[model samples]
Target: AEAPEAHMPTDPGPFDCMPELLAAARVAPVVRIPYLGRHAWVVCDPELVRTALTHPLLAKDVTLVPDWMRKPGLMLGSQPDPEFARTMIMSDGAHHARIRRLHASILSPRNTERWGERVEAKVGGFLDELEASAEVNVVTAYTHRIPLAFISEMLGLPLEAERRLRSITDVILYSDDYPARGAAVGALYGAVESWVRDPAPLREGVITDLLAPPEDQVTEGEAIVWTFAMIITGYETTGSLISASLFEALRRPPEERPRTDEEIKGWVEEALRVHPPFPHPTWRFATEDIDLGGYLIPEGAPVQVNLAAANRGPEEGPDCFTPERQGRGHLSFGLGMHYCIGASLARLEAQIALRGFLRRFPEARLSGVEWESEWMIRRMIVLPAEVGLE
Candidate 1:
């Protein structure tokens, strides 16, 4: 079959890749576009996006890709070693389920809510730091720190590991060069290995729990990979959510911003809908020939679900930031089996961060905002703001 002639928009705007993705979606629900070094089908329609995510033949095994098509990065599909890549996001069937279940209890909604006080405290400390200065770049001073602090603490990692891990993960996420990304991956693995083998007093967190009496439930290698996955997955996405939410809220008039907790919650949902961190969630390959959105995606073809495009599908004022919209049905956290386990935690953190920020600096004004030229994970590099502080 000849490749479907559709092009991804070259002009992704300053903030995100939405301009290209939405434009492509308007042309067709399923468009074939170049990804990595090869062409993959981009699924854009809302219902079709859901189908693509949950379809039986669309598998998450990244090792299936032949040698010729492989590319380097820290993403799910790029890894070749099955053991090193045995994470919930990269596994399928029973393997995925087992890995997911091991971390389910800690990341569950109920368990996440239990961390609200700690999360709030963390936000407050960061807010205090933000309050100290009349002007600051919120990305480094606030947005990036909150999730990193919480996730590192949750993983029983020492305070020293936070800065090093942040640098390592930044390279893994932001670097365009394959060698740098691959090197960052090695650094991440090494950091996790050191932590796992460290003899210091362990905090009562996910790492200690995983290595507890239920030892057979998780292997040492799996535990290292899980920690590696959590650090990479948990930090940037949640940071982006908080950054985007704050950016959107600050853009509105003071009277228009969310005040009440419920209003803030709704606002976060709208933010996630409009500016999803992972615009195109990790890669899925067609295990066998499958019909998706009336398009025949041949076996071995790569599939990318356009979460940002699907969120803005055919609806009343889809692009508008309306928090009052009922049943958002956004695929930002994904759908079905591979749904993000950290969804609840992310929402909680963003809500707390947003609410706390607005409460403290209602009159905060943005001086400058710069977004990274990244499609897979959208984030702000610098969010300069001036708090009306004396």
Candidate 2:
């Protein structure tokens, strides 16, 4: 087990050096490190992290994506497929703003409130299934299902759609098998295109909204790209939060304690601060050389924003859980133009899931589990738990 400040390491080896890197990042805002056998710089200061995110000199260039993702078939020459790269995550400047507007229209606080009921219903359904067994893996049976259903509903896709998406995500994030990764990547884009071309049973999900935005804010191809990014980011990150919160709850001694909406929100924020699902920001590269905090970032050099260090470091206190302790919150969701578009929806899903989960199975306790060793997400691969009687 690790402290609250634990980070997801990038290496698949038994020993991970990322924890050491994250710790050093706090003192050295910029540190040159080896990433996939190449030199990369990691930025750890919150202010510097924000600068790296917003700076025009730093670009979201994936030309140097590591070997693991190279064979995944997403590449097109030195860049990802133009259609995929045009999505908000890879896009910059004005184009990114337009894509973001389409997302904001759908994930507004009011709309999120409307979606909350549907998520609760889904959570209830999973709990019903879990009642059939004395012991369950909440990650699969509960936490994961709630978000999967919510994402499926949000995208107006079937249950199988999530299964397909997860398959692609797994291959891209976890598997090193080149053949398998290539096949999954092909299928992944094909599914997204199919959904756009003939998106029947498409209710007013965000994808549909993008299709019919004001003056057609996004094209059909662009909508598919947006939908693909949202489906993966929205569901996976929120699920990680739910699992982390539950693990924290079960670890606490149950006696003489209750919570407020504010307190629960604080818990979620603290969890995010300590354990960002993606410990590092998406890979960016220096478009042109720039000096940052006395360190020179050379052009084309890969740079990663060390989110775990920025969030848990000296600038941000309460490295351990203390709900009442607060400031402006941490940089877990990121800070600048590239901030997570699903921020509102992610928090909504987490809050709704946590409240319902605690009420349904107050006596739920962790049996035995192992945290996911993969670098992409800070989460449990399996969380065995004993649920309370209905």
Candidate 3:
């Protein structure tokens, strides 16, 4: 018998719950309550977070839970254990070592640097498109489309295909009407299925690199699960960052724009502190009763840790987002082995994205804020900037 953790809020998406959830965890070492169909506890203290993340007592293997958590509409979930968990989000220990080896090579800073030109060009196009439109929905045109285009092209999908991915990803993340969500998931699977059937130019895409012949110990269906998981990682979350980061930099006074790359990095850090890209709680099945952050979490409990909540502490807090807070660091990116695998790439994307916008609209005002929205994520939904450059 175990209790599921329900500390992750049901309000304004998971993120809206962030401020309050951290409040509860600060006073209590662990908060236990019902989740889905079972009992669990939520952990927030940094030291305790380190222990849970580092030790084997908390399983990265989601097989301990049900399938519907990932995408109920699609009836799909992580599979072919060890391989699935091996990614930054799911795996732990030796499995993390083996698979991440192949990934480490490409996901490196050097490899990410190679992606800069490609991203700038796409952003350049977006900047052009934004300048010309009478009304701009950065969520649709810039934030969502730009990253999809960059990744799709990186993977060697036809440039034309980039058009469809943003829409498909929206459905996947926001979970459109169930039928819409179902079709979106189907299209996503179809896209992957097409690649599996004829992985042309496997040289271009991460999937080709990941699912290459001799190396795939995981089954094809299983590989599909992992590959689609990568899509979900890249598309929605990154798109949301564009919305969040833009609003942050734009709201600050013109004097607040950082003068150099180092200063800009500081601003980027604050943006992440204020609005982490993916603010979802990760659930783990506790293997045994353990003292963490002073509370006892029992075996079979589904443990949920709120990254956003921790981002509110004295360090990450009130001070974390202030440009004056310069180098203050926060756990916007998780710590330990399960830290986000795409951390470097994401940093680059955000850096360039935030800088490009600020530089382009140094004098721009936050023209519209009314329509900003959230769905398991807080985003501008629509970010407007008035600029004239010819």
Best by lDDT: 1
> Model 3, 105: alpha-carbon shift in Å?
4.1
Worst 10 residues of 1 by lDDT: 9-18
Q: Model 1: per-residue lDDT, tens digit, 211-279?
A: 765434777778788888888897788999898888877777778888988898889998899888887
- TM-score for each candidate, following the candidate numbering: 0.91, 0.85, 0.83
In candidate 2, what are the lDDT values of residues 265-328, reduced to their tens digit?
7777777776677777677777888887777887776677877766765754323555554314
Candidate 2 Cα outliers beyond 4 Å, as residue runs: 1-9, 12-18, 24-27, 61-85, 107-110, 201-204, 212-214, 256-258, 314-319, 326-328, 374-376
RMSD of each: 2.8, 4.8, 4.0
Task: Mark the regions of model 3 whose C-alpha exceeds 4 Å error after superposition.
Answer: 1-8, 11-17, 66-71, 74-88, 105-111, 176-183, 200-203, 210-223, 314-320, 368-376, 388-390
On lDDT, who's better, 2 or 3? 2
Q: Clashes in each model (backbone N, CA, C under 3 Å)?
A: 0, 0, 8
**Per-residue lDDT tens digits of candidate 3, residues 110-219?**
55557887778778888778777643555666677777776776555666666777778766555536677777777787787777668773446666655554453555
- Could you arrange the candidates by lDDT from highest to lowest? 1, 2, 3
lDDT of 1 at 76: 49
- State how far residue 114 of model 1 sits from its true place (Å): 3.3
